[PDB]
Amino acid sequence: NERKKNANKIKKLEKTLEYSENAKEFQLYGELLTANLYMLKKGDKQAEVI
Amino acid sequence: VKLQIPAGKANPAPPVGPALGQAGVNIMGFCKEFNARTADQAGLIIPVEISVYEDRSFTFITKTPPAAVLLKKAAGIESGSGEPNRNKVATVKRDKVREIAETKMPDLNAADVEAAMRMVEGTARSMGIVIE
């Protein structure tokens, strides 16, 4: 049990894990806005980026 | 504005593109001005102070690298002592103190060699290093 049990629960961990990262996307762009922190409005959605 | 950049690198936007993008300079233009003047090692670190007049007449003084950098290269540390006065993760010489004096006595900030060393060693204990 404990062998197969936790083998199952831990491949299950991995299975559930692979999906979401959602961090460096928008991290690098927060850095971009910090860089271009002089062309901004508080009232926009879009950006222009390099 | 103080910048802290390797002598051979250019166009790191995120550091100065803000810092003198409100000033509005060519990122690679000024960074290659910097490399042309300090045409030296990339991966190095020069402190460099830029002075801009009201009409955007920029000049700057490059200066000697940090003793942190020189002694990271000496001892082989990436971070300083995780706890100075409890961990010493790096070691140098009195000879190294004199080497760094002769390196940077232009930039050093006490008129005597011994008071220069007092400040240098204030920094050596700041970053937690022992002597050989």
Curated annotation (Swiss-Prot), chain A:
Induction: Up-regulated under secretion stress conditions, possibly in a CssR/CssS-dependent manner.
Recorded phenotype for the gene knockout or disruption: Not essential in rich media; synthetic growth defects are seen in double rqcH-ssrA mutants, further exacerbated by translational inhibitors spectinomycin and erythromycin or at elevated temperatures. Decreased accumulation of a stalled reporter protein. Double rqcH-rqcP deletion strains grow normally in rich media. Triple rqcH-clpP-ssrA mutants cannot be generated. No change in sensitivity to erythromycin; double mutSB-rqcH and triple mutSB-rqcH-ssrA deletion strains are hypersensitive to erythromycin. Loss of Ala tailing.
Coiled-coil regions, chain positions: 1-37
Assembly, per entry: Associates with isolated or stalled 50S ribosomal subunits. Binds to RqcP. Interacts with ribosomal protein uL11. Displaced from the 50S subunit by thiostrepton. In crystallized 50S subunits RqcH is variously associated with A/P-site tRNA, P-site tRNA and RqcP, an E-site tRNA or A- and P-site tRNAs and RqcP2(YlmH).
Function: Key component of the ribosome quality control system (RQC), a ribosome-associated complex that mediates the extraction of incompletely synthesized nascent chains from stalled ribosomes and their subsequent degradation. RqcH recruits Ala-charged tRNA, and with RqcP directs the elongation of stalled nascent chains on 50S ribosomal subunits, leading to non-templated C-terminal alanine extensions (Ala tail). The Ala tail promotes nascent chain degradation. RqcH, RqcP and charged tRNA(Ala) are necessary and sufficient to add an Ala tail to a model stalled nascent peptide; does not add Val.
Note: Activity of this protein is best tested in a clpP or ssrA deletion mutant; ssrA (tmRNA) encodes the SsrA tag added to nascent proteins in stalled ribosomes by trans-translation, which targets the nascent protein for degradation.
UniProt similarity note: Belongs to the NEMF family.
Domain notes: Has 4 domains; N-terminal NFACT-N, central helix-hairpin-helix (HhH), 2 coiled coil domains with a beta-hairpin in the middle (CC-M), and C-terminal NFACT-R. The NFACT-N domain contacts 23S rRNA, the A/P-site tRNA anticodon and recognizes tRNA(Ala), while the M beta hairpin binds protein uL11 near the base of the bL12 stalk.
Protein name (Swiss-Prot/TrEMBL): Rqc2 homolog RqcH
Species lineage: Bacteria, Bacillati, Bacillota, Bacilli, Bacillales
Gene: rqcH
Coverage span on the entire protein: 300 to 349 of 570
From Swiss-Prot, chain B:
Description of post-translational modifications: One or more lysine residues are methylated.
Subunit record text: Part of the ribosomal stalk of the 50S ribosomal subunit. Interacts with L10 and the large rRNA to form the base of the stalk. L10 forms an elongated spine to which 2 L12 dimers bind in a sequential fashion forming a pentameric L10(L12)2(L12)2 complex. In stalled/isolated 50S subunits interacts with RqcH.
One of the record's GO molecular function terms: large ribosomal subunit rRNA binding
Matching InterPro entries: Ribosomal_uL11, Ribosomal_uL11_bac-typ, Ribosomal_uL11_C, Ribosomal_uL11_C_sf, Ribosomal_uL11_CS, Ribosomal_uL11_N, Ribosomal_uL11_N_sf
Disruption phenotype: Depletion gives a strong growth defect, a ssrA deletion and rplK depletion is synthetically lethal. RqcH is no longer recruited to 50S ribosomes, no change in RqcP recruitment.
CDD domains: Ribosomal_L11
Biological processes annotated in GO: response to antibiotic; translation
Gene3D superfamilies: Ribosomal protein L11, C-terminal domain, Ribosomal protein L11/L12, N-terminal domain
Keyword hit for Acetylation: no
Presence of keyword rRNA-binding: yes
Protein family membership: Belongs to the universal ribosomal protein uL11 family.
Protein name: Large ribosomal subunit protein uL11
Keywords: Antibiotic resistance, Methylation, Ribonucleoprotein, Ribosomal protein, RNA-binding, rRNA-binding
Function: Forms part of the ribosomal stalk which helps the ribosome interact with GTP-bound translation factors. Required to recruit RqcH, which is part of the ribosome quality control system (RQC), to stalled 50S ribosomal subunits.
